[PDB]
Ligand binder design. Structure first.
Ligand code: HEM
Ligand SMILES: N[C@@H](Cc1c[nH]c[nH+]1)C(=O)O
Length: 392
């Protein structure tokens, strides 16, 4: 039994409130029970890094009861490493740079172009959501407005991958995936043809060459590009935008020198993380210092609690793109499951923000309307703003 804490479901106009809450809780106890979120939360750095590394004690098996069964995240040990190698190939530095020139740079120019002719826009819906959606489109050879229509189902899918102790959340997730399976099957069938010229077509050929091209594997490839490449990446872009908007002098520096964008992106992941960490299944009784966890417990590794550890990052409430070494990205997880798509997400954030800042030198937040930040923004599983109104 752990002390109670209320870390997740608390709204604030301060983007730092989430990180500050987690840090303040971590100073008081290593492990807390977040009643509204509904599970124990590991907050102490030593416990978290141990958990990420000891996959035999802290597994991803809970994923086998839900729509990710048969995907990469649900695999363990040797099965996992072999398929992981195959996913890794499509996010290598060279591959990502081809995506940048062919797909993401031009698309970014087009998304930013359609914001002009409006004195004010919501950069959340019109930019952070729109750009990753359209990238996943071009990787599929498939229209982005068709993905736009899956939004309620995409977030329904994701919510059942987080609050897995909730039977209703899990069942709605399975339902939403079932309602998306026709579309998934359409994309797979079309891009499995020799006539296929898309990246997704490249991917399905590689799976076949390793004799891994089951219906299930091909569906989970597509599913992860939707859940990760579209919805999750959106909140990274959105939180990076906000951090700059909320720091006009830094925004100006970054516009004048775009080579600062990677640091701005990493610092934004520290200062305003869009994800908290990961979920794990405790597979055997384990003692963490004087804490005990029972086998069968699903826990949250809230690695972003270290984002506000002032011993690592002094004045952690300050957005400082000049921190060196750059803060460790905890929003991508840890250990062998560490996000394989991270290189694409980082590149989309850099290229999109570069086009946005170059096209609108006068860009600024709407002074009256402050965003509200919370975990679960617009029914997502991200910590992010409810809106990003700007003046162009
Ligand atoms: C801002 C963007 C993203 C964030 C914050 C993020 C976060 C994460 C995290 C924390 C994990 C680990 C889950 C766990 O260990 O339980 C993960 C895994 C994964 N993510 Fe990402 N992700 C992002 C974008 C993407 C993209 C763009 C893709 C693919 C195009 C993607 C695909 C995957 C896959 C396939 C895995 C499973 C990896 C494995 O188990 O080996 N994600 N992601
Ligand atoms: N949660 C979904 C989508 C996602 C990918 N990366 C981060 N999130 C999954 O684990 O695939």
């Amino acid at each position: 039994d752990f002390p109670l804490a209320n870390l997740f479901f608390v709204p604030s106009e301060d983007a730092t409130a989430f990180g500050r809450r987690l840090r303040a809780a971590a100073q008081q106890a290593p492990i807390v029970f977040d009643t509204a979120f509904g599970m124990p939360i590991l907050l102490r750095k030593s416990h978290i890094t141990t958990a990420y590394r000891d996959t035999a004690t802290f597994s991803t098996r809970m994923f086998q009861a839900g729509i990710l069964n048969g995907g990469l995240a649900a695999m363990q040990g040797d099965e996992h490493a072999r398929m992981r190698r195959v996913y890794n190939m499509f996010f290598l530095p060279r591959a990502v740079s081809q995506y940048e020139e062919r797909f993401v740079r031009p698309i970014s120019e087009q998304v930013v172009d359609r914001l002009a002719g409006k004195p004010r826009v919501d950069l959340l819906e019109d930019f952070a959501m729109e750009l990753p959606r359209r990238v996943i489109g071009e990787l599929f050879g498939f229209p982005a407005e068709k993905l736009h229509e899956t939004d309620e189902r995409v977030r329904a899918m994701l919510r059942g991958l987080v609050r897995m102790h909730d039977p209703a959340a899990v069942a709605e997730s399975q339902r939403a995936y079932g309602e998306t399976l026709g579309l998934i099957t359409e994309v797979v069938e079309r891009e499995s043809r020799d006539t296929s010229d898309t990246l997704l077509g490249e991917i399905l050929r590689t799976l076949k060459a390793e004799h891994m091209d089951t219906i299930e594997a091909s569906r989970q490839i597509v599913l992860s590009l939707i859940l990760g490449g579209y919805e999750t990446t959106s909140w990274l872009v959105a939180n990076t935008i906000h951090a700059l908007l909320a720091h006009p002098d830094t925004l100006a520096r970054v516009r004048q020198d775009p080579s600062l964008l990677p640091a701005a992106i990493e610092e934004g992941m520290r200062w305003c993380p869009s994800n908290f960490g990961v979920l794990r299944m405790v597979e055997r009784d384990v003692r963490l210092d004087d804490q005990a966890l029972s086998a069968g417990t699903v826990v949250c590794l809230a690695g972003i609690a270290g984002n506000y550890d002032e011993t690592a990052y002094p004045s952690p409430e300050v957005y400082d793109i000049d921190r060196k070494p750059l803060p460790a990205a905890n929003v991508f997880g840890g250990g062998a499951h560490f996000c394989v798509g991270a290189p694409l997400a980082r590149m989309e954030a850099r290229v999109g923000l570069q086009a946005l800042l170059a096209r609108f030198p006068g860009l600024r937040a709407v002074p009256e309307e402050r965003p509200s930040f919370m975990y679960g923004a617009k029914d997502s599983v991200a910590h992010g703003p409810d809106k990003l109104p700007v003046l162009l």
